[PDB]
């Protein structure tokens, strides 16, 4: 250990990739929405749990703008800017493509808190169109992830529920002041 | 070898940067841009007059810098800042994207002024953009139908060879060529997003 | 000095953090609104430098309403915009700006000297809404031109950019300043 081991961390960290998996639900008590031509705003906010569903997170917030409909996808296509908010973990942001009839990729833009000085993708999947999403965001730069956020991940499908504990915001089921 | 020289490649990659060239042309076929009036101010004849909060959604079509090939679309939002009598000097703040098909997509915010060259900040890319950072260069050529853009993109790997043909100097004449327009399999990224 | 050097140059580039402060103030010359969910909000203010001496630009972008909270009788905002300093270039933010307390935004990146950038940025709430304080946290680039660099004025309410700045003296601006 020395010089070069040193350098050679650094780049390790600036190059490292780490994979981070969180549901969004919309539980429709946020009054948060749920056209077809160019033009219509949606501003939104959903909640978000870890990827065990056993931990309420905190919150989406952001805004989506309508681009364009597909007559034989049977859906739009909308350009999105939001931020996934973590309690005091910090956020995320991204910026990308939400398509109502099919799973897209987003940039994420940066992050604060344990996610400063990120970058990379965050893959979005429908499960439940468009209540129910499942996201894994593919982060480069940063530090170790906390364990609380590397839980082992439940496949998402239909039955996948958060526990009733995180969706009351019970102390032992909520991330350090998450946000709401 | 291997250590000093895996480092080295490693950093190289990391600070390395390379250019692309594209052109973005509305050729008015897909009801872009709309105007949101919401400023609400208006005029002496019973008109639509620019005010802050103006806002402009739109979607343009991409073509490569050879102009041989139609890449996909842009698709994004401009917020109205400042405006005056004069034609040049408008400014609007945006956020958008640049889609290339399967290739993948391109995110920018930044400053968009009438009739003046800007640069734009490069937030990231998917695909093969993934992971990028840096900063787009934006000409108008035709105001508001025809631009023009260079991106420098830092921290991604060796772009393809399709997205990397000799480009046609941005000028007013500057088209797309008949098979690029009416999109034939030879002339389109594979799966050109529209 | 030598290939070793060279490299662990670039890479203390690459990681390497630098401190900018700036004051952000509303001299409601610019038509832009002093503060209905989903409501949007677009926006421009003037930016000075940290000490206060030098007119850098402007903020331009936008904020939409996401949420009431009465408890703290404050709104929640999700926003987008940037910083403008002239010839220097801008910065790009997107995050949370909360009407009772100070928050962090993400620095999506940069132009000019700021090209490549990222980072954070501290929003610091002084006068609401007409007087804000940042401080950006920014990693990747070159060392930052000493003007932009003076010793930082600590934000309070007192707060106030020179005369000399308010009228935009060549001595006390950023070169082509935005406005």
Redesign the interface.
């Given at each position: 250990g020395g010089?070069?081991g040193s350098?050679?961390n650094?780049?390790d960290?600036?190059?490292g990739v780490q994979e981070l998996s969180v549901y969004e639900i919309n539980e429709r008590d946020?009054?948060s929405p749920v056209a077809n031509?160019?033009?219509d705003?949606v501003?939104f906010?959903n909640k978000v749990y870890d990827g065990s569903l056993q931990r309420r997170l905190g919150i989406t917030?952001?805004?989506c703008?309508?681009?364009?409909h597909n007559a034989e996808k049977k859906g739009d296509?909308y350009?999105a800017?939001?931020?996934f908010?973590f309690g005091d973990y910090?956020?995320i942001?991204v910026?990308?493509?939400y398509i109502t009839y099919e799973d897209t990729?987003?940039?994420?833009?940066?992050?604060?808190?344990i996610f400063?000085?990120c970058?990379?993708?965050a893959k979005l999947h429908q499960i439940i169109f468009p209540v129910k999403l499942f996201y894994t965001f593919?982060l480069?730069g940063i530090k170790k992830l906390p364990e609380e956020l590397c839980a082992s991940v439940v496949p998402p499908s239909p039955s996948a529920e958060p526990s009733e504990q995180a969706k009351k915001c019970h102390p032992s089921s909520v991330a350090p002041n998450f946000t709401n």
């Open positions: 010089p070069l350098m050679g650094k780049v960290k600036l190059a946020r009054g031509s160019l033009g705003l501003p906010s917030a952001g805004i703008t309508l681009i364009s296509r350009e800017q939001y931020s908010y910090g956020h942001s910026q990308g493509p990729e987003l940039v994420v833009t940066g992050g604060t808190g400063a000085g970058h990379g993708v593919y480069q």
